[PDB]
Design a protein around this ligand. Structure first.
Ligand SMILES: NC(=O)c1ccc[n+]([C@@H]2O[C@H](COP(=O)([O-])OP(=O)(O)OC[C@H]3O[C@@H](n4cnc5c(N)ncnc54)[C@H](OP(=O)(O)O)[C@@H]3O)[C@@H](O)[C@H]2O)c1
Ligand SMILES: Nc1nc(=O)c2nc(CNc3ccc(C(=O)N[C@@H](CCC(=O)O)C(=O)O)cc3)cnc2[nH]1
Ligand SMILES: [Mn+2]
Ligand SMILES: [Mn+2]
Ligand SMILES: [Mn+2]
Ligand SMILES: [Mn+2]
Length: 159
């Protein structure tokens, strides 16, 4: 099973200048809990944005060009990325925009954080047909001293 996990600001913005400008520790904790001990697939730009391997996960990087770091697994196509995960129950695709576009048709589950923040950005999460997805979990949180915006955790499953 393939799942996508992302955090979206207003208008589905996910990034600006290869960075995420907000800081929501609660959302990073949610990301870690839902990805630990699973393989994660990312594109090369997101790998450079993160800057280091994510511990406790098999890190698979999509790039057309040879890898430059043997701490992670480099693959050259979607089918190769899936094969490199092996026979696991759940594969997590962690972006960015181009990678999300390619895996969305193959995904059965979306883990979305909706952040109440207006961000000028240059990368967006793909348009997804709402009729195709059922919301199976949602949890709203007001802003607090650690998290400066309100946010909504949602899990959607393909109908
Ligand atoms: N808010 C969130 O949840 C979230 C999550 C992830 C990322 N982001 C943000 O998203 C932005 C990065 O997104 P992006 O769309 O620019 O880049 P991306 O999807 O991370 O990376 C695209 C790169 O991945 C490689 N790639 C993708 N598909 C491939 C394929 N089928 N075969 C081979 N290589 C492939 C190519 O690398 P080569 O040019 O090396 O071939 C391509 O240029 C940043 O702002 C980051 O902070 C946000
Ligand atoms: N829900 C969600 N929120 C995000 O911010 C997010 N970000 C990305 C891409 N960017 C990043 C950047 C840093 C780390 C990272 O360092 N994660 C640590 C958290 C510990 C910490 O730095 O506080 C990890 O171990 O997972 C992960 C993804 C992909 N999916 C996401 N999904
Ligand atoms: Mn092929
Ligand atoms: Mn198999
Ligand atoms: Mn949203
Ligand atoms: Mn806000």
């Amino acid at each position: 099973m393939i799942s996508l996990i992302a955090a979206l600001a207003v208008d589905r913005v996910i990034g600006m200048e290869n960075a995420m400008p907000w800081n929501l520790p609660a959302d990073l904790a949610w990301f870690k809990r839902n990805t630990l001990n699973k393989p994660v697939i990312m594109g090369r730009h997101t790998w450079e944005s993160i800057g280091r391997p994510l511990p406790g996960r098999k890190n698979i990087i999509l790039s057309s060009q040879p890898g430059t770091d043997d701490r992670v697994t480099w693959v050259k196509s979607v089918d190769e990325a899936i094969a490199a995960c092996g026979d696991v129950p759940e594969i997590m695709v962690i972006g960015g925009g181009r990678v999300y576009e390619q895996f969305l048709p193959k995904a059965q589950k979306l883990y979305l954080t909706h952040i109440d923040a207006e961000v000028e950005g240059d990368t967006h999460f793909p348009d997804y047909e709402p009729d195709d997805w059922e919301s199976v979990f949602s949890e709203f949180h007001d802003a607090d001293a650690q998290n400066s915006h309100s946010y909504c955790f949602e899990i959607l499953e393909r109908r």
